[PDB]
Design a protein around this motif. Structure first.
Motif, short mmCIF file in Angstrom:
data_model
loop_
_atom_site.label_atom_id
_atom_site.label_comp_id
_atom_site.label_asym_id
_atom_site.label_seq_id
_atom_site.Cartn_x
_atom_site.Cartn_y
_atom_site.Cartn_z
N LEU A 49 0.79 -1.41 -0.08
CA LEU A 49 0.09 -0.05 0.02
C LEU A 49 0.91 1.34 -0.08
O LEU A 49 1.80 1.17 0.82
N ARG A 50 0.23 2.35 -0.64
CA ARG A 50 0.90 3.51 -0.55
C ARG A 50 -0.06 4.81 -0.62
O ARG A 50 -1.16 4.34 -0.91
N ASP A 51 0.20 5.76 -0.49
CA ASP A 51 -0.60 6.92 -0.42
C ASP A 51 -1.30 7.25 -1.72
O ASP A 51 -0.57 7.46 -2.77
N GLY A 52 -2.47 6.99 -1.93
CA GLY A 52 -3.21 7.43 -3.21
C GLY A 52 -3.44 6.51 -4.19
O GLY A 52 -4.04 6.80 -5.44
N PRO A 56 -1.56 10.88 8.47
CA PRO A 56 -0.51 12.03 8.39
C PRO A 56 0.43 11.86 9.32
O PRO A 56 0.13 11.56 10.35
N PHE A 57 1.43 12.78 8.99
CA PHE A 57 2.60 13.01 10.06
C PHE A 57 1.88 14.01 11.11
O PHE A 57 1.78 15.06 10.79
#
Lengths: 232, 232
Positions: B188-191, B211-212
């Protein structure tokens, strides 16, 4: 379809039509063509688009727009009526029966605090062609003169009201036409129909003989009004 | 459009899709195609008949059939629900925990006094394909066995409920298809977006990085909680 019944003696069809028109100006609400256009546009919307019974079955099974639009319109009329009642009460509270002014200038003073609510109510009830600002100011000074309450001022505008409330040009008594299948000098009899036609509407008048009534006595003993506590 | 959010670690798109399907059978209400046909017939009814903004303006000014039909349907569902609650309460009052019979025969005894109200409720809520009479009798004997109230019996039928309440053929875990723009063994990754397609519906899953977060202390003196009776 507004309908009222009247009793008359031996008159001709002329004179019966005259008494009917007297009672028309006294009794029927005033002809408002703007209250009639919704049915005309609805019939024209049906004009935009064995089998005649199935089409009626599909119509009566569909969504009745008319029920919900009438309920929503009645709700809007009640809301505008409440706004109008509050506006006219808080307008009449601004002056005192005692700068000194006559009821015309007092009417002109307190009218801008009720004018918009009255305008919106006369538009939602489709009565805005019947009341000019001069007419409303004259009736306002009339009610201020005679010590009438806000509701007594407002009863002219809340309902439709008969034809003689309004201006003398809004009723038109010279444009009446009498349609009859027989001579109008003949007397009334059972079952005749005569029509009183104005420019847009008509008064359809059918005459019925008042029936032969047979009365009889029966004796009720006032001692025979005895009651028991037993259930019936 | 039913939507839920889930947190996952470093999984591949395969294993993330597996956890999504686990949570689908646990969490989402069951796919009911009968709850979707009203929008399809409404779009087909629009298919029966600059300018695209004026047509939308004429649509939004028209009579909204949908608001009143949804309010009327919700009213009918509440009425059928009240009938069903009364029927199931007066059905459960007919037997006693103690002719001696097991919970299957007690369920078969008290079911004809609730069967019509339950049938009408499952038809009005479009759940009648999900509950055979055998299934309802098994759940009825189940609730009679375990000492459950009429409302506890009835919660299976009042709402939609998740997919694992129902029969094992009504869910179908072998017919899942994974659509992804990349290799499903990638993590998995962002987007990224992957789609889990069943036979009629699909689960559209877009992945966002959590989020950080930057935390910091601030000191609030517990002596600084002084209040006054003055208005603020």
């Amino acid at each position: 379809g507004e309908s009222r019944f009247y009793s008359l003696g031996h008159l001709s069809i002329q004179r019966a039509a005259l008494v009917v028109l007297e009672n028309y100006y006294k009794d029927f609400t005033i002809y408002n063509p703007n209250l009639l256009t919704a049915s005309k546009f609805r019939a024209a919307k049906h004009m935009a688009g064995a089998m005649i019974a199935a089409a009626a079955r599909r119509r009566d099974s569909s969504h009745n727009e008319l029920y919900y639009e009438e309920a929503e319109h009645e709700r809007r009329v009640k809301k505008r009526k409440a706004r109008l009642v509050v506006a006219v009460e808080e307008a009449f509270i601004h002056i005192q029966r005692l700068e000194v002014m006559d009821p015309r200038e007092a009417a002109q003073a307190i009218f801008p605090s009720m004018a918009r609510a009255l305008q919106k109510y006369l538009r939602i009830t489709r009565q805005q062609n019947y009341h000019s600002m001069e007419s409303i100011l004259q009736h306002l000074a009339f009610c201020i003169t005679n010590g009438m309450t806000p509701k007594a001022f407002l009863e002219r505008y809340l309902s439709a009201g008969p034809t003689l409330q309004y201006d003398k040009d809004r009723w038109l008594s010279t444009q009446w036409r009498l349609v009859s299948d027989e001579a109008v000098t003949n007397g009334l009899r059972d079952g005749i129909v005569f029509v009183l036609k104005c420019l847009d509407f008509s008064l359809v008048v059918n005459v019925k003989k008042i029936p032969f009534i047979i009365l009889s006595e029966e004796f009720i003993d006032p001692k025979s009004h005895k009651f028991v506590l037993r259930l019936q």
